[PDB]
Structure 1
Amino acid sequence: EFLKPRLVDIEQVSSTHAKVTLEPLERGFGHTLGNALRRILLSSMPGCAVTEVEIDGVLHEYSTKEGVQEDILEILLNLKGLAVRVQGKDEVILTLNKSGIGPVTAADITHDGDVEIVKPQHVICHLTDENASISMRIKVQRGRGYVPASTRIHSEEDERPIGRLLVDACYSPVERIAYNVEAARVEQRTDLDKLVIEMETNGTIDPEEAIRRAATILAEQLEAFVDLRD
């Protein structure tokens, strides 16, 4: 009646780019699976993102320190795009500590055993003074979807410390999803197509785990359909 799609070669043309293939897919199912996986990947992917940042020198987002050529708002904006993976802990607090002239990048963050920076060249700021020193506490936590700092700030009621700065956390690891259904020719069964999913991700989530999580979410959703409450 049906043949079963199986995870076949998952190539990495780039660190952030992954092409995952599903060969044994029935014709008429390629578009269904492709669209479903695209939706799930863009919507419900768990990921690690920065939520709150504590900078020693400043009291709010709209100030600046000495020896930095980027506004504190610009540092927060750059940190928004920071790509990081945490394994054991759901919430971690990284410490960034650097003085001296130079481009303060992501690799300068004090790395723990459970925290991996997959984009070490991601510039955070620039120090243009010899004695200028940056010390920051960057809180990175797990989440899915898009949770801006205007919804949990109503669930925190004006967070008590004034030295901490909340940033909108885009937990989505994947930035681009495409799927192509093409005629997969194989000896058994004349009518089969394969689904080639081309994915651009910030490197935080592996494509294999990505597809597995999307399938898990879809199956959990379909569980309600399987057994109907009457």
Structure 2
Amino acid sequence: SVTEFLKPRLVDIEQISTTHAKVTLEPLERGFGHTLGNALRRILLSSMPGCAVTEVEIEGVLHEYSTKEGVQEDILEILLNLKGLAVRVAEGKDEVFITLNKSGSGPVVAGDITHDGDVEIVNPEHVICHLTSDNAAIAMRIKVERGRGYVPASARIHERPIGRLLVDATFSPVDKIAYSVEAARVEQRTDLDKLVIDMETNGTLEPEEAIRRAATILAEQLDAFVDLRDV
């Protein structure tokens, strides 16, 4: 009828790659596709929780603006590379420590990090540094924290030992969101639409799960309007 609408359902999920996916919502009434797509894009791009590197500790290193023998990259470049690490932490833990020791010439990559089985590395081929000598060795202790949004090192409220290096953390796993509203063939009606959301992420967050968190956030914010009263 006119009063009653049709509620969309998640009808298709497509995983083109580890960092790329498409989610299909169907059916939608006239004009609701754009509304839901824009709302979900704004929520997904702003308020998705994730895990990021926050603190690093390298043996023999006192500050970022320094050098280590047998390493082609400075500590600043190593920290910038560590900023791009994709880590999934098992639920219930908001803080974890991983460890990276490597000796010998070659590219030190993310697949050489030793974890406790509750941490998953989504990009094992991510190059972290390069060791240019057979005598060169690297030993690092990395702190991974769960969070939301972007928290720079300066914004963290203030003892911290000399040698602990703060890293700016971008917790949000979502990189790119696109949405398209197309025609849907449901029963005999033509007015029904279909919403396809293209998500490009770091692989940490599942597409369906992210969709549900965005919907939950939107519903919780709408609850204030559903019960409009002077407070």
TM-score by length of 1: 0.96
Check conservation: 2:53, 2:82, Cα contact below 8 A. yes
CA RMSD of aligned residues (A): 0.9
AA aligned to 1:197 is: I
Q: Does 1:32 align with 2:35?
A: yes
Aligned to 1:163: 163
Picking from 70, 74, 78, the partner of 2:77 is 74
The alignment status of 1:105 with 2:109, answered yes or no, reads: yes
Which string of whole-angstrom CA distances, capped at 9 and with x for unpartnered residues, describes residues 185-221 of structure 1?
2214331100000000100000011101111111111
Report matched runs for 1:120-159 at 5 Å.
Answer: 120-152=124-156, 155-156=157-158, 159=159
User: Hey, what does 1:215 align to over in structure 2?
Assistant: 215
Aligned residue identity for 1:202:
N
Q: Distance in 1 between matches of 2:186 and 2:132?
A: 61
2:185: which partner in 1?
185
Task: Please state whether the residue corresponding to 1:77 is helix, strand or coil.
Answer: helix
Q: State the percentage of identical aligned residues.
A: 87
Inter-partner Cα distance in structure 2 for 1:180 and 1:100: 50
Give the counterpart letter for 1:111 in structure 2: H
Matched residue of 1:12: which SS?
Answer: strand
Partner of 2:24: 21
**Could you say which residue in structure 1 is the equivalent of 2:51?**
48
| Secondary structure of the corresponding residue to residue 16 of structure 2 | coil
Counterpart CA distance in 1 for 2:220 and 2:171 is 21
Distance in 2 of aligned mates of 1:18 and 1:78: 25
Question: Which shifted more, 182-191 or 208-217?
Answer: 182-191
Cα distance in structure 2, aligned partners of 1:22 and 1:35: 14
Q: Kindly indicate whether the alpha-carbon contact (under 8 Å) linking 2:184 and 2:190 is maintained by their aligned counterparts in 1.
A: no
Structure 1, residues 116-172: CA drift from partner, whole Å, max 9, x if none? 0010000100011111111111100001111111100xx11xx52111000110001
Which one of 15, 31, 36 corresponds to residue 12 of structure 1? 15
Q: What residue is the counterpart of 1:84 in the other structure? A: 87
Q: Equivalent residue of 1:34, what SS? A: helix
Count of residues in correspondence between the two structures: 226
Amino acid at match of 1:132: A
**Cα shift at 1:229:** 2.9
Residue type of the alignment partner of 1:118? V
